[PDB]
Amino acid sequence: MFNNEPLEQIDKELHDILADEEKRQRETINLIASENLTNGAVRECLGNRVSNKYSEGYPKKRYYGGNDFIDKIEELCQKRALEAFNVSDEEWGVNVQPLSGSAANVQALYALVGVKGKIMGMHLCSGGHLTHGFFDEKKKVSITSDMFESKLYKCNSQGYVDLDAVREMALSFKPKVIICGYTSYPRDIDYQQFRQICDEVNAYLFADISHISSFVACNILNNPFLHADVVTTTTHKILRGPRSALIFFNKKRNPGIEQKINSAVFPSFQGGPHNNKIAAVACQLKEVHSPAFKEYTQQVLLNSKALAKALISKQIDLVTNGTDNHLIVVDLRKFSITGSKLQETCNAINVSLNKNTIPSDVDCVSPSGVRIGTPAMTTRGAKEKDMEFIADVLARAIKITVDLQEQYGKKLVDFKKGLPGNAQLQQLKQEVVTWAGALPFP
Amino acid sequence: MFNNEPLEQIDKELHDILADEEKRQRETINLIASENLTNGAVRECLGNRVSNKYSEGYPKKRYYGGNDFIDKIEELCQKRALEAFNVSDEEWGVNVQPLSGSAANVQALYALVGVKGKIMGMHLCSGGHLTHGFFDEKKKVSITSDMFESKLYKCNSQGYVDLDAVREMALSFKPKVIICGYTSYPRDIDYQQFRQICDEVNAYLFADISHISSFVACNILNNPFLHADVVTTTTHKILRGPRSALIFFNKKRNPGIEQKINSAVFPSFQGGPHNNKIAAVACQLKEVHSPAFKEYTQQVLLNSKALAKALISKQIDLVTNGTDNHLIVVDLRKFSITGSKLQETCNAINVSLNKNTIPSDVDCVSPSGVRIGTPAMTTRGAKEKDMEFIADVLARAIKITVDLQEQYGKKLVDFKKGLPGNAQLQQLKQEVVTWAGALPFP
Numbered sequence: 001m002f003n004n005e006p007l008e009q010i011d012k013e014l015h016d017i018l019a020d021e022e023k024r025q026r027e028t029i030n031l032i033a034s035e036n037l038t039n040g041a042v043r044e045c046l047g048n049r050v051s052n053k054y055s056e057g058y059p060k061k062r063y064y065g066g067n068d069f070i071d072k073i074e075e076l077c078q079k080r081a082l083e084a085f086n087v088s089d090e091e092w093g094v095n096v097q098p099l100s101g102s103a104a105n106v107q108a109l110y111a112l113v114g115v116k117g118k119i120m121g122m123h124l125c126s127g128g129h130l131t132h133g134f135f136d137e138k139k140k141v142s143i144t145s146d147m148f149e150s151k152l153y154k155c156n157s158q159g160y161v162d163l164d165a166v167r168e169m170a171l172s173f174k175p176k177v178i179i180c181g182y183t184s185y186p187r188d189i190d191y192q193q194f195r196q197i198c199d200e201v202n203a204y205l206f207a208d209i210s211h212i213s214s215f216v217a218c219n220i221l222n223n224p225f226l227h228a229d230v231v232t233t234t235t236h237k238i239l240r241g242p243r244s245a246l247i248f249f250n251k252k253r254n255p256g257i258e259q260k261i262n263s264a265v266f267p268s269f270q271g272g273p274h275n276n277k278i279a280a281v282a283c284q285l286k287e288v289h290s291p292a293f294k295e296y297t298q299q300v301l302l303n304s305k306a307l308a309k310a311l312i313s314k315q316i317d318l319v320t321n322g323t324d325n326h327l328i329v330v331d332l333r334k335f336s337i338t339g340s341k342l343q344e345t346c347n348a349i350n351v352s353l354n355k356n357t358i359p360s361d362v363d364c365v366s367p368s369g370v371r372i373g374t375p376a377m378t379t380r381g382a383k384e385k386d387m388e389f390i391a392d393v394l395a396r397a398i399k400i401t402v403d404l405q406e407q408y409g410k411k412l413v414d415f416k417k418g419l420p421g422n423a424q425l426q427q428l429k430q431e432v433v434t435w436a437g438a439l440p441f442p
Numbered sequence: 443m444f445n446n447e448p449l450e451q452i453d454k455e456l457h458d459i460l461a462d463e464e465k466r467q468r469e470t471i472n473l474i475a476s477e478n479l480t481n482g483a484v485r486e487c488l489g490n491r492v493s494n495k496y497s498e499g500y501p502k503k504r505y506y507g508g509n510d511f512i513d514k515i516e517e518l519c520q521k522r523a524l525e526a527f528n529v530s531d532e533e534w535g536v537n538v539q540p541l542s543g544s545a546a547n548v549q550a551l552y553a554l555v556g557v558k559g560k561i562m563g564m565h566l567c568s569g570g571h572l573t574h575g576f577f578d579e580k581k582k583v584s585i586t587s588d589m590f591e592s593k594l595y596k597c598n599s600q601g602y603v604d605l606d607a608v609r610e611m612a613l614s615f616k617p618k619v620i621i622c623g624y625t626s627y628p629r630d631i632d633y634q635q636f637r638q639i640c641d642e643v644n645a646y647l648f649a650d651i652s653h654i655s656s657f658v659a660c661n662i663l664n665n666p667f668l669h670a671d672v673v674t675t676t677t678h679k680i681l682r683g684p685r686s687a688l689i690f691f692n693k694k695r696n697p698g699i700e701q702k703i704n705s706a707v708f709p710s711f712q713g714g715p716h717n718n719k720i721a722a723v724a725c726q727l728k729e730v731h732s733p734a735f736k737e738y739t740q741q742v743l744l745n746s747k748a749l750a751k752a753l754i755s756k757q758i759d760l761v762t763n764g765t766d767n768h769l770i771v772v773d774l775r776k777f778s779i780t781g782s783k784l785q786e787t788c789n790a791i792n793v794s795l796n797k798n799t800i801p802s803d804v805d806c807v808s809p810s811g812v813r814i815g816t817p818a819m820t821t822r823g824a825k826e827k828d829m830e831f832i833a834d835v836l837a838r839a840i841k842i843t844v845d846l847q848e849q850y851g852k853k854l855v856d857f858k859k860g861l862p863g864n865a866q867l868q869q870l871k872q873e874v875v876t877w878a879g880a881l882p883f884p
């Protein structure tokens with residue numbers, strides 16, 4: 001007693017929009033540093049019947065029965081998680097149930113400090129995440145500043161973490177948790193010098209490596225697992241998994257932490273795990289451990305290096321003047337345009353990127369930069385030689401943005417009206433669509 | 443630069459477990475009242491490439507661009523949502539982003555009351571959900587008792603919501619939110635009477651209709667939308683959608699509540715939405731509003747009535763001596779066995795049900811009942827005539843549990859040793875598998 005008709009039949013209208021979205025994805029140069037494209041296998045798992053099953057609790061300790069094949073899956077996922085990140089059963093545990101990077105952070109932070117607890121994180125405009133305790137002056141924008149009492153540190157004017165300001169603010173504030181690892185940081189992190197600050201004040205060290213997880217896994221960047229009490233990471237983004245998250249916790253450094261994290265996730269916050277998510281994570285953490293994935297991660301970094309260099313060779317400025325990772329923040333002050341306007345121009349040419357603050361920005365409104373990243377295009381098979389074209393496309397986009405701003409004004413509302421119809425944009429778009437359209441697409 | 447090989451090939455190990463789980467689901471009489479089986483179309487959406495896309499924010503008001511087709515999906519889903527539950531655009535709003543029923547309740551409650559806010563809900567052992575403010579004498583088990591100040595009401599010894607106890611507790615405690623709608627309540631709810639209690643205290647009325655959502659949509663049970671300020675429902679369970687949740691809010695009764703709910707979800711709690719979830723919710727809500735779905739919901743109620751009746755006809759006691767909905771709680775005291783034990787016996791015979799407390803249980807350990815429901819089996823095509831067999835199977839399961847208990851003792855560990863290699867159970871299991879196995883299976 002159900003309708004078994006395929007999606008095309010059963011809901012034509014939704015099948016059409018979904019087909020368009022796929023075409024868009026396929027025909028776009030995607031530079032969103034936090035996006036990627038999952039393979040077909042991951043998507044078979046996300047659509048598996050395993051999500052019919054309710055599984056509140058943990059393996060061997062479920063509320064309900066019938067959970068034997070489910071337990072093997074969660075078990076496999078924890079196994080594959082701890083090894084991908086080169087840690088041992090006996091030092092580190094992992095929770096694979098958090099539904100999102102934001103959930104994992106909220107849960108992990110609750111487990112460590114509880115309500116009213118004190119936390120330190122990097123400011124949003126400076127490149128920290130919302131769930132790192134973000135607030136405005138007026139109101140607590142993130143639960144992490146309301147459930148918790150949070151203070152925010154900034155980066156210096158060169159766009160580097162001001163470790164000395166981290167110490168100044170910590171000693172005065174005495175947080176129980178200091179969060180590092182960011183949303184928009186083009187340089188690797190000094191986890192050791194964070195480990196020293198926490199130790200100095202008896203704080204937990206929290207590394208959110210969501211943006212760079214693959215570099216940590218692949219031994220290409222610094223290892224927070226030698227210094228952190230807790231590491232969180234999304235499974236999507238550069239890891240190229242489904243939409244989910246992982247909480248790692250150092251048993252050796254804090255016995256009794258395993259209980260605090262496992263019970264914070266459920267029953268404090270979540271209900272039943274989403275087992276399709278867990279299956280898909282398992283499926284990608286296998287891939288993550290294969291040496292072809294290390295190749296891919298290396299290709300990501302090469303492309304990023306090549307992208308930065310090509311942009312510099314076209315006299316475009318980058319925050320910190322380069323990158324150690326997959327992402328580049330462009331400083332646009334030189335051209336008297338906002339990242340705000342450039343996003344609009346690139347949207348108009350099937351190029352995906354987003355506005356981003358730069359150190360000199362006092363507010364988060366009308367920011368002076370854009371963030372770009374190479375994980376998605378690398379997945380699509382672009383190599384170092386392809387970065388010049390992307391850089392070329394971006395420079396042309398910056399130039400057209402300058403031309404349209406002089407013709408239509410600095411007012412963002414007014415700027416947009418210039419975009420539609422523009423022959424330069426249409427030609428550049430078609431250039432993009434023609435190159436993007438035919439690239440490998442999972 | 444990715445692996446395109448199918449799941450069977452790319453990860454044989456996971457594929458075999460998943461295949462086993464599909465066979466378990468198929469060969470089980472599944473009476474878990476909160477479970478169902480999604481159709482293929484819902485599962486094409488869960489594995490759609492739409493989940494590649496980051497969509498922080500709401501339609502027309504996203505952080506990033508490239509979001510036109512995503513915006514059309516979220517808008518469709520909210521539209522199909524508001525009509526399914528027969529409410530007008532102009533009186534009711536919905537948020538389709540919450541990832542789980544539990545997140546919806548945490549997010550919805552935070553929007554209404556804020557940290558330290560006062561809430562009232564039904565106790566867990568009485569059938570209220572964890573996210574209704576559950577705590578123990580020792581621990582704040584759910585975030586909803588720690589983040590908020592919560593008080594828990596109970597049902598009377600007949601298993602009915604004790605409205606007089608609700609008013610009492612509400613006047614003494616003055617909450618800002620009173621939650622009703624439950625996890626394990628076999629009867630319909632008097633929302634008008636809750637609405638009156640909330641008015642005398644100026645509290646919000648919160649209806650979590652996750653278990654009975656389809657009865658509300660199809661106009662078979664009472665309509666909470668006539669009285670409630672806020673209604674939450676999972677999209678899974680009886681609604682038979684994917685794993686996700688909805689928050690409905692009454693604009694007409696509460697000005698400026700729309701932004702309170704929309705902002706608590708994001709950016710207070712969640713990050714990007716999971717667009718595959720929103721897609722799938724849209725696809726099922728289309729179904730919900732179709733006349734075939736009302737038929738199904740009617741078959742669910744018919745089946746429950748027949749199962750209740752056939753259980754009574756075999757001298758088995760039911761809490762409230764029947765049901766108005768999809769679920770029955772069996773009282774086992776008459777047989778001197780625990781729900782705990784019966785769950786084990788039914789596990790051993792491919793029958794899924796769960797232990798449940800009854801009013802006379804003061805412990806939530808070693809409870810005296812079991813909860814059963816008809817949504818999953820109705821989906822699989824069982825009709826009223828088939829409930830006899832299921833009642834017959836449960837009666838026989840109770841008897842074997844009786845026999846095994848006095849042969850092995852009343853201690854849980856001792857009891858379980860009797861299950862393996864018991865000829866009666868293997869025979870009964872065989873009968874179950876044979877009947878379940880050939881039933882229609884999405």
Ligand SMILES: *Cc1c(COP(=O)(O)O)cnc(C)c1O
Binds near residue numbers: 034101105712714
């Ligand atoms: C993207 C991100 C998150 C949140 O991930 P979601 O799954 O989108 O909630 C958390 N922390 C960091 C550093 C991130 O980059």
Ligand SMILES: *Cc1c(COP(=O)(O)O)cnc(C)c1O
Binds near residue numbers: 270547625650
């Ligand atoms: C099952 C349930 C929930 C939570 O649903 P999840 O998706 O498992 O978080 C919330 N409220 C009620 C009444 C429920 O039955």
